[PDB]
Ligand binder design. Structure first.
Ligand code: BGC
Ligand code: CA
Length: 516
């Protein structure tokens, strides 16, 4: 893995449940047989959306957790764990959504203004999730929902592995900047979503708060606005993405635009911890969308991420850290293209995000963006997951492998693995001052024969006078590997003579010993 390390010892595989209720897709008894089958294939838990629209349908505090409780009972019956997603977003409308569960209708009646929803640059109204600007409504409703959910799930504490929160549309922390109705679906640039009157006033007040008055704002921006009402979000979104973002005004607007998401993160994080910590004591996480198109566009750099709210990933991730939330990223199965007209760089996106999270010490989890129909994608997911310290991977979605034994078998082999600590010992390594010893092998867990950035480093044991290391390998899988020496300048000096193997890696901790 990156930086001479191996795979994450805590790595687990999870499976996403269908979007519709189980009884609408199959039956409870069959569902239980299915769970035992997934467990047989390396899946540790099933993640599942519990829709706000289902749980607080009829009115304020008129809760219904009966489905969630029944689901949990079946999970307990099958001997599995589950990861609930408190889905405060709408099901339906997003790519791959076979369902229709909008958020409770009574919610929209809580406000007379337009503070609750989104309005794009061109006046497109979005109502699939509450506007994070309305933190007063969010604090009340989410606080109430999280607290009631905790009490209802208390009896099933034992089968709950962790909790996922919904930070926005499709369960991702972002703005609904890419939609067909708004004419911003992939691979087009996105549109900013701060055009409600409420959003304009908030931006305005944020600016005057930072500067004090219009005379200071004009000084800072080098502008000549005549009144405070002239303080507005970008009039031309494309021109803004083209050059507007470079100005002090642009930097300020993007700081505020993204900041709303960071504050939201800290709020829902505080509410979640308060509601679940003392009872479940499990990790809580949220998701960041993988907006890979328009990434390397030369005229509108990152034209899709920015309108979604992602301007500075490092500062965004700092919010998760302070909120005590684990992060889930997506697109692990994709490769960089970076060509016109899509300018899609999914792999680069993932590598950078993983790097930031790892340096900040944020637990990292991954998902595939689209359904996988070939083992080649499983291979791509494996490379990223096992070399970038991912603590977990969640497969979208249930039906794909549940009804395809061939795909299920390939998943088990490549990703449904159990990490086991093993000691690799290599004798007689002809090193000189400055030389370092590494090992690389055939599987993604071993760096796939890469010697540049994925090899696993060994260390000299002054006592036993040899090179060894406590390497984490996938249990019960056949592996092939060879040790090699790297010179001080970082180049490969030589390779171990005979190729080593472990068929398979034992389930219990042992040690593989070989001579150079
Ligand atoms: O099942 C997890 C997530 O899957 C996505 O494909 C859906 O759009 C989300 O609404 C859902 O929360
Ligand atoms: Ca309520």
């Amino acid at each position: 893995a990156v930086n001479g390390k191996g795979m994450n010892p805590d790595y687990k595989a999870y499976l996403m449940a269908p979007l519709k209720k189980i009884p609408e897709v199959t039956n409870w008894e069959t569902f239980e047989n299915d769970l035992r089958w997934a467990k047989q294939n390396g899946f540790y838990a099933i993640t599942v959306d519990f829709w706000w629209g289902d749980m607080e349908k009829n009115g304020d505090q008129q809760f219904d957790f009966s489905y969630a409780q029944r689901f949990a009972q079946s999970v307990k019956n099958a001997g599995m764990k589950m990861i609930p997603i408190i889905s405060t977003h709408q099901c339906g409308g997003n790519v791959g959504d076979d369902c229709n569960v909008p958020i409770p209708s009574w919610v929209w009646n809580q406000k007379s203004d337009d503070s609750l929803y989104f309005k794009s640059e061109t006046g497109t109204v979005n109502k699939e999730t509450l506007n994070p600007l309305a933190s007063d409504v969010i604090r009340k409703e989410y606080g109430e929902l999280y607290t009631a959910f905790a009490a209802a799930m208390k009896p099933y504490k034992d089968v709950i592995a962790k909790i996922y929160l919904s930070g926005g549309p499709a369960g991702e922390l972002r703005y609904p900047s890419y939609t067909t109705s708004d004419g911003t679906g992939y691979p087009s640039r996105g549109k900013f979503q701060a055009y409600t009157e409420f959003a304009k006033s908030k931006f305005r007040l944020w600016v005057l708060n930072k500067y004090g008055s219009l005379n200071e704002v004009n000084k800072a921006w080098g502008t000549k606005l005549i009144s405070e009402l002239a303080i507005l979000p970008p009039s031309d979104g494309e021109q803004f993405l083209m050059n507007g973002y470079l100005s002090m005004y642009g930097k300020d607007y993007l700081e505020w635009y993204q900041g709303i998401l960071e504050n939201h993160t800290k709020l829902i994080g505080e509410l979640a911890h308060n509601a679940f910590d003392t009872t479940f004591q499990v990790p809580i996480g949220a998701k960041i969308a993988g907006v890979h198109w328009q990434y390397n566009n030369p005229t509108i750099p990152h034209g899709a991420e920015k309108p979604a709210g992602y301007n500075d990933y490092s500062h965004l991730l700092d919010a998760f850290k302070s909120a005590k939330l684990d992060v889930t990223f997506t697109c692990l199965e994709m490769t960089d293209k970076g060509s016109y007209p899509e300018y899609s760089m999914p792999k680069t996106l993932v590598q950078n995000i993983a790097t930031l999270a790892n340096e900040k010490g944020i637990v990292l989890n991954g998902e595939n963006a689209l359904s996988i129909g070939n083992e080649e994608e499983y291979k791509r997911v494996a490379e990223m997951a096992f070399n970038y310290n991912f603590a977990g991977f969640t497969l979208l979605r249930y039906q794909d492998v549940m009804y395809n034994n061939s795909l299920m078998g390939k998943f088990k082999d490549l990703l449904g693995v159990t990490p086991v600590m093993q000691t690799i010992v290599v004798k007689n390594v002809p090193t000189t001052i400055g030389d370092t010893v590494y090992i690389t092998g055939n599987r993604a867990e071993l760096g796939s024969w890469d010697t540049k950035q994925y090899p696993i480093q060994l260390y000299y044991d002054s006592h036993s006078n040899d090179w060894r290391g406590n390497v984490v390998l996938p249990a019960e899988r056949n592996i092939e590997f060879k040790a090699f020496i790297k010179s001080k300048d970082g180049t490969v000096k030589s390779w171990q003579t005979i190729q080593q193997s472990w068929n398979p890696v034992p389930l219990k901790t042992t040690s593989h010993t070989s001579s150079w």
